[PDB]
Design a protein around this ligand. Sequence first.
Ligand SMILES: Nc1nc2c(ncn2[C@@H]2O[C@H](COP(=O)(O)OP(=O)(O)NP(=O)(O)O)[C@@H](O)[C@H]2O)c(=O)[nH]1
Ligand SMILES: [Mg+2]
Length: 162
Amino acid sequence: MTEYKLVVVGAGGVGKSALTIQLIQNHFVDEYDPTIEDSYRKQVVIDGETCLLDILDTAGQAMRDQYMRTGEGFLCVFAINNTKSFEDIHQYREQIKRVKDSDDVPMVLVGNKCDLAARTVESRQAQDLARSYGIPYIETSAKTRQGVEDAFYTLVREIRQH
Ligand SMILES: Nc1nc2c(ncn2[C@@H]2O[C@H](COP(=O)(O)OP(=O)(O)NP(=O)(O)O)[C@@H](O)[C@H]2O)c(=O)[nH]1
Ligand SMILES: [Mg+2]
């Protein structure tokens, strides 16, 4: 079946793994468990198309080049209560542009942890960035499962259109 090679990238602690497990295992991981490299396979039906999501959950901590090269779509994740993570987005996208040799790659900017009240990054600020990159912006919470399916599915739709 049509495979989709998705890669979740972002700074440490922004909730990359949490967004992934909530999609596959349908539950929120409220524990300290830093990722080295984990891969998930799932048969799903998206817009009536039987496809398989081959998702690679990356570490937040030269070595990235390997999986960025084989990835088709990318979830660019930052935490809305962490300005540093939002700023680190630019570095990640730059390295993806470098290893892909492309200015336009299927990509979605995710603003995670939107359930928290201690926001430090305004949604307008992130939206302006997403506009500048030419990609969609979506706010999510792995805790309440808000926007989770929205984030991953939209990414698939961007690949289909690429
Ligand atoms: N309130 C809230 N907390 C969240 C959310 N998503 C993740 N967290 C939490 O924030 C922490 C970090 O989660 P984790 O998914 O491991 O982040 P990560 O970016 O994969 N870490 P790394 O890249 O280092 O392995 C956890 O303690 C976790 O439950 C969220 O959406 N809302
Ligand atoms: Mg992780």
